[model samples]
Target: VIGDFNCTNFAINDLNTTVPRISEYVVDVSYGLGTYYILDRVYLNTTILFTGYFPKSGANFRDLSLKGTTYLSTLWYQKPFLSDFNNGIFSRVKNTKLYVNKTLYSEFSTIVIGSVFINNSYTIVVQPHNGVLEITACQYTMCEYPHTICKSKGSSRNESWHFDKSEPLCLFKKNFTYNVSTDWLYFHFYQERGTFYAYYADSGMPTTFLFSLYLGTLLSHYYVLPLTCNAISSNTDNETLQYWVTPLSKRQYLLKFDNRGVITNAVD
Candidate 1:
């Protein structure tokens, strides 16, 4: 039951559903600014609503379209791979074959683009003697070519593994953006003497917190929670761990874990 109570040369006709209907929409000038357009509005039958006549400080309507599209305003920068090791990227890889140290394993073949993987067969092999590894669908067999293989090295016992050396390559650009995707590697040690454990955030965690917890531990070798164990013996912890939720903003939060994989307290 709402419309312009008074009229002028501009017939401002805006209405909501009259039959038990509640919805939210916005109206504003097409291109003009200030008092030239009618921004005064009304609403009916909606418990919560948002209405704005003018653009906010950073609002640029040209970026919006009538097609109703959403955008990723910010992306969390995640470390692409584990530290203390090497990796290779290829322009093309096979869907049915996997390469390991001096052997090919068809059963372990996998593919991934973004966080989504066509098949999540975490089959990278860690050979014990001479400490070597392998990956296929490699772009560069050697690291001499541009946009083929870019070589970087680190010094540590953990960092000593043979890599394909020339698979993924990139270059610097003035205005550039990368895609949002993730691939995972699960290392199952066969003869190592330490705890064979894996840690992951529970479902519904913010990506920011997940990436932070992931790379934070990779650099410093620390964890808010130690591995929680079960009774099936292989020295491997098979249970998925959980963390505490700490909100940072309306759209963001931090995940905290305890020494026993319990939600202990807020990080800040």
Candidate 2:
């Protein structure tokens, strides 16, 4: 308690990628063309405290993903930080590949991907392949962030998964703010019975809900005011029935039934 309480500042500068000399406390540098071997992971007392991609890149990667958070994935079903992970914070996605940096093309697209967490700390590497890194001797001496399921929807509604500020942003998604007042729902539902709760100020406005597992907001941003709470809902078994209330209109509290991918109509 007498020492530094800031867990982030306690990062051991001598971490190594299972090697002889990647443990230096040096400034990050550029490696080659469109490639990077920068700091991608950090460990805390033998546990991974942070893991992300190279902070800088100059390839043909643009914002193929959503503009706000960086937990992008080609496979919409599987959550980020899995196989193994759970710390997706401040990271972001890419830009448009249509043209820039003094060049142009007919097509440019991408969807930013990846998040962070941790695994084994290492100081090892191979000669012609990727390698492992380690973080030895971890001494966590504080309270970690607690978990919460539902939240009071204040001014915004983002129902998707986001990276954690609790952990480091070795692998961060881009941070892009939308100009419009759109309800961007992005919560990572990792359980069979994942639920979400929000608190609203009760403003009478048209809130469009183009339903799906993800990416339902972009296309014309349909279904506002009496927002048609659309599909991907019928999976009844699991993703299974979560709870959502509307101070804005229609249903007070809705329950879902998984028949043929349809929500149980809760109208009185």
Local distance difference test, each candidate: 0.17, 0.17
Deviation of model 1 at 166, angstroms: 3.6
Q: After superposition, how far is residue 21 of candidate 1 from its true place, in Å?
A: 42
RMSD of each: 26.9, 25.4
Error of 2 at 103 (Å): 44
- Candidate 1: the clashing residue pairs are 84-159, 89-167, 89-168, 90-139, 114-181, 114-182, 115-182
User: What's the TM for model 1?
Assistant: 0.14
Q: Which stretches of candidate 1 lie over 4 Å from their true place?
A: 1-111, 114-163, 171-205, 208-268
Residue 209, model 1, lDDT: 13
Q: lDDT at 139 for candidate 2? A: 20
Clashes of 2: 48
Per-residue alpha-carbon lDDT of model 1 for 67-186, expressed as tens digits?
000111111011211111111111111111223355532211111111111112111221111111222211112211001110111111111112334533321112111111112112
Q: What is the TM-score of each candidate against the true structure?
A: 0.14, 0.15
